[PDB]
RNA sequence: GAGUACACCGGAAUGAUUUGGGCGUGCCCCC
RNA sequence: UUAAAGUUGCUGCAGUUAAAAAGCUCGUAGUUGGAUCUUGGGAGCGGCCGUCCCCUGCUCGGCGCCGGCCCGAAGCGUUUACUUUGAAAAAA
């Protein structure tokens, strides 16, 4: 390609490129919320939780730390959030 | 590339462009700072403090929600130790490697890595001497293992 | 070249590539004075006027000639923008 | 590591112009590079270029028009007087009807042709033709 | 009433009318639980390059963190009070001169020209925030800033972009346009 | 107040009267 | 002895095979070192731009005016490099 359009490329190319090789750098992680059906107390958990997170009040286990994204236990809903 | 390794790595954090406190968390600065002083009184490293905050309490960075980072706060009230945490970890690694070599004589790779980490701690000690953090006459010695572990 | 007398001392004006804005020399045989025809406005016929194009040897040598002829035809308006 | 941002930017422009890329991307940014690209585009070698303002270090998108042959730098930054510029433009330029040398005078980064009129010399950055 | 200028000077009647409107909306609406220390430094009437007029209100810097919670209701109250005029809050920072070598205390970077202009551009468009700033360079050398605005709270900010361009040109001198990218959010 | 579906109110809309809940602001429980 | 010598290469050499990268790593002297701190306009010379003025000062005094204003200033403005002007620099 003699001329790409690096002014405003397509967003599939922006997800195709690296997190730092993009036009403006932006992380590929997000902040998310999670609840347990057998309990109340709700916390907000990072997408790479990096450690075992406890329910706030010592009720249940929520995330298992892995190499990348943390794994949620079954029966727990999750949504992201944005501003 | 790396300072003491042949490989080149490209894997680090990448902050977003947005300069704002997000609206989905409504947590004022002072109660957050109270959580830092409580977690520091529990006896933990500021890196672990930032990890625990962004894990459980949902805050992205301290620098956007307050005017200061963690070590500025712990220096402002005074719970920050005199030994910096990275140099403390390098000291503890040097003590562990030296004890391993003391109980295992015929070894060369461990000795080579010991020379590498002594070079690293010396090159960092020059920086902490010229930025007036450490005392100017403070010299690390291999035999001074039980002073600051 | 101009001159103090106002007389051009040029002996022949060399042509220029329409794609990479480079100059086609005297002994370059990989260059084409391409002619493109436009349609008559009412139904389908041929007027007689020409829409001429040129390209040098290096662009065809690396092979980006189809891209260049698309951009030139889109700039002159032969090919629609949706494409 | 990287010692000269301006050299890497100019030699990236040199590579992408030598093949025939229409527009480029430059990874770091500096003020002196911005003034150099302005004097490039007001002498007409470079079209309407974009620079991007992020919060770490900016990036520069320069569209090219093909008139540029080679643009290079001189390292390290020597000093040149008004009596020594003639030798530098004799042994560094391809001709005398075209090709300019930028240099950091006391009035800022500007070309040698108006520096002869301004009667001010200083350190030297590079050249283009 | 609720106006404390840094200097003991009497300005024109317009900011007096602004303060009278503020006390009227304070005494009529249920805002008395959130307006105790909220002073106003200054206010100015301007006209954009067209057929409309706009209102600048200058506020002090540390007070604006309490002005986060008020600018959902206060802006619509001032818009329904003055129908043909748009209200906008800009913090009052000062620019310090560069410490030239022929010229005392250190100049902090919070008070420099770039930080003041960045803060002014950030506090102009409050309901929608910045996504990215681009800056063109023209043939004449005129640097043209184009800033990308958020998709969130889109419906409030189509009609105010010319007022923001006018106030930034008549306050700083830089031509600024506005755009809405839609391929990221 | 145990806040998952809930029992009390204060503001407030049409001299009188009054509209299912949760905090993850947008989709979840109940009809 | 000099040019030719771009065969001593700062302008301006070479190091896979022709002469030429230490077996490898660390390391004190030495060399080099990322971004960033001031913008813009006006009256006019004219039918946007080539010329020109503007944005650290506070005790002695000589251009005037009706005890106050530019002022001539003894006194002072964190250090360096770079560049232009000026002096001193013997003649042949």
From Swiss-Prot, chain A:
Biased composition (Basic and acidic residues): 1-15
InterPro entries named among the record's database cross-references: Ribosomal_eS27, Ribosomal_eS27_Zn-bd_dom_sf, Ribosomal_zn-bd
ZnF C4-type: positions: 36-58
Phosphoserine: residues carrying this PTM: 10
Highest taxon, organism lineage: Eukaryota
Cofactor, how bound (note): Binds 1 zinc ion per subunit.
Cysteines engaged in disulfide bonds, as pairs: none
Binding site for Zn(2+): 36, 39, 55, 58
GO molecular function: structural constituent of ribosome; zinc ion binding
Function: Component of the small ribosomal subunit. The ribosome is a large ribonucleoprotein complex responsible for the synthesis of proteins in the cell. Required for proper rRNA processing and maturation of 18S rRNAs. Part of the small subunit (SSU) processome, first precursor of the small eukaryotic ribosomal subunit.
Self-association and partners: Component of the small ribosomal subunit. Part of the small subunit (SSU) processome, composed of more than 70 proteins and the RNA chaperone small nucleolar RNA (snoRNA) U3.
Family: Belongs to the eukaryotic ribosomal protein eS27 family.
Name this polypeptide is given: Small ribosomal subunit protein eS27
Species of the source: Oryctolagus cuniculus
UniProtKB/Swiss-Prot annotation, chain B:
NCBIfam families: PRK08561.1 (NF006331)
Protein's job: Component of the small ribosomal subunit. The ribosome is a large ribonucleoprotein complex responsible for the synthesis of proteins in the cell. Part of the small subunit (SSU) processome, first precursor of the small eukaryotic ribosomal subunit. During the assembly of the SSU processome in the nucleolus, many ribosome biogenesis factors, an RNA chaperone and ribosomal proteins associate with the nascent pre-rRNA and work in concert to generate RNA folding, modifications, rearrangements and cleavage as well as targeted degradation of pre-ribosomal RNA by the RNA exosome.
Family: Belongs to the universal ribosomal protein uS15 family.
Post-translational modification: Ubiquitinated at Lys-26 by RNF14 and RNF25 in response to ribosome collisions (ribosome stalling).
Gene: RPS13
Residues with Phosphoserine modification: 29
Residues bearing PTM N6-acetyllysine: 26
SMART domains: Ribosomal_S13_N, Ribosomal_S15
Positions where Phosphotyrosine occurs in the chain: 37
GO cellular component: cytosolic ribosome; cytosolic small ribosomal subunit; nucleolus
Pfam family, one: Ribosomal_S15
Subunit structure: Component of the small ribosomal subunit. Part of the small subunit (SSU) processome, composed of more than 70 proteins and the RNA chaperone small nucleolar RNA (snoRNA) U3.
Cross-referenced InterPro entries: Ribosomal_uS15, Ribosomal_uS15_arc_euk, Ribosomal_uS15_N, uS15_NS1_RNA-bd_sf
Subcellular location: Cytoplasm; Nucleus, Nucleolus
Cross-link (Glycyl lysine isopeptide (Lys-Gly) (interchain with G-Cter in SUMO2)): 42
The protein's name in its UniProt record: Small ribosomal subunit protein uS15
N6-succinyllysine: residues carrying this PTM: 26, 33
Cross-link Glycyl lysine isopeptide (Lys-Gly) (interchain with G-Cter in ubiquitin) per UniProt, renumbered positions: 26
From Swiss-Prot, chain C:
Domain of life (superkingdom): Eukaryota
Main location: cytoplasm
Subcellular location: Cytoplasm, Cytosol; Cytoplasm; Rough endoplasmic reticulum
Placement of covalent cross-link Glycyl lysine isopeptide (Lys-Gly) (interchain with G-Cter in SUMO2): 41
Entry keyword Ribonucleoprotein: yes
Keyword Ligase tagged: no
UniProt modified residues of type N-acetylmethionine: 1
A molecular-function term among this protein's GO annotations: structural constituent of ribosome
One Gene Ontology CC term in the entry: rough endoplasmic reticulum
Family: Belongs to the eukaryotic ribosomal protein eS21 family.
Assembly and oligomerization: Component of the 40S small ribosomal subunit.
Free-text function comment from the UniProt entry: Component of the small ribosomal subunit. The ribosome is a large ribonucleoprotein complex responsible for the synthesis of proteins in the cell.
Protein name: Small ribosomal subunit protein eS21
Organism: Oryctolagus cuniculus
From Swiss-Prot, chain D:
GO CC terms in record: cytosolic ribosome; nucleolus; ribonucleoprotein complex
InterPro entries: Ribosomal_uS8, Ribosomal_uS8_CS, Ribosomal_uS8_sf
Entry's Gene Ontology BP terms: translation
Keywords in alphabetical order: Cytoplasm, Nucleus, Ribonucleoprotein, Ribosomal protein
Family membership: Belongs to the universal ribosomal protein uS8 family.
HAMAP family registered for this protein in UniProt: Ribosomal_uS8_A
Protein function: Component of the small ribosomal subunit. Part of the small subunit (SSU) processome, first precursor of the small eukaryotic ribosomal subunit. During the assembly of the SSU processome in the nucleolus, many ribosome biogenesis factors, an RNA chaperone and ribosomal proteins associate with the nascent pre-rRNA and work in concert to generate RNA folding, modifications, rearrangements and cleavage as well as targeted degradation of pre-ribosomal RNA by the RNA exosome. Required for proper erythropoiesis.
Name of this chain's protein: Small ribosomal subunit protein uS8
Protein's organism: Oryctolagus cuniculus (Rabbit)
